[PDB]
Structure 1
């Protein structure tokens, strides 16, 4: 099988700059590598065929290159609408194969997360549940680490973390962190805290409430 190794899977680039995506095949290809762009909601769309031919309506800023074992997609200069997943693909022998994909994101200025914490609603409590929720909104870059504390003690059991993709509006990220407890345990502790570590802060960013 012609294995396609695509790197990096994740790449950030400032507007005006040059994005380069590499795709190395385990054995040699044409003239048979293609590239696909996949925007968030949509199906993949053919971008490059052959190795360097643009498809209908593909901006000249997109250029593919390479031969034999080694291919590339370069977009120069990157614009705001270039945010997408990019996939290389060989059409030369069955099994047709794809690279793992690259998520292209806009690099922008660091932004500290804005944090909100929410006690379980009375409606969940009355049903026996007790989820505590922390929103960590509009930050950059995307790497962030969230810890939950209960009465000052760390708790990683029952923690659900979820990141949005890059926001089209301001190129920031947001993430949600949920500590799932039962009401019986929730009622037995006083204070709940989510703490996050991020580039924009030397100390943990903290948000807390006392149950009442």
Structure 2
């Protein structure tokens, strides 16, 4: 078992900056090291093979170098679309192995979330349920917290959050928060509020509606 140790685990780099990834083989693998780029929801795609050969269609900014046990991938001027998990592998000898991957994030200027709130659909209410949804869209950095309030009191239970992958064009994140109540609960209370706490503001960024 040849161990490929890949560094760093993750990194965050601004557009235009030079990016360095390394891969260390536990024994001599000559030049039989390749790098793969894997964008969100996609298969890995070959970038570099034979340590230093760019594959067809791979832009000039990606270069590989190295031999024996030391291997490097460099992006000379990282672009927004380059966000991906990057993987090295050796195909010198069986069993074939891969490094642990590098999650490349794009660093950009802070952006405040834009918040939208949505009452339960009439369809869902007819069925006996009531979900209140809040989208927090296009913010940076990824760190964010949401607080739900019903008639001025915090509500912690029944909340399900989900974050998108970083956007490949504008380098932001978005987040969905869903508060699920029973229909009886929902028809009881009047004011529903989601409050986003993010670095871009010292106060919560809030959105609410009155059911009545």
Cα pair distance change 1:194/1:25, threshold 3 Å = farther
TM norm structure 2: 0.85
2:62 is aligned with 1:62:
yes
Displacement of 1:69 in angstroms is 4.7
1:11-160 matches, cutoff 5 A: 11-25=11-25, 29-67=29-67, 69-160=69-160
126-135 vs 103-112, which moves further: 103-112
How many angstroms does 1:162 deviate by? 1.5
Q: TM-score, normalised by structure 1?
A: 0.85
By how many angstroms is 1:113 displaced?
Answer: 0.5
- Report the more deviating stretch, 73-82 or 86-95: 86-95
- Which sections of structure 1, spanning at least 5 residues, go unmatched? none
Distance 1:135 1:30 in 2: 50
1:117 is displaced (CA, Å) by 0.8
Query: Which whole-Å CA distance do the structure 2 matches of 1:41 and 1:76 have between them?
Result: 25
User: In structure 2, do the counterparts of structure 1 residues 91 and 149 end up closer, same or farther at CA, with 3 Å as the change threshold?
Assistant: farther
The 1:99–1:194 alpha-carbon spacing in structure 2 relative to 1, beyond 3 Å, is farther
**Offset of residue 211 of structure 1:** 2.8
What is the aligned-residue RMSD (CA, Å)?
2.4
Indicate if the aligned counterparts of 2:195 and 2:205 stay in contact, CA closer than 8 A.
Answer: yes
* Partner SS for 1:95: coil
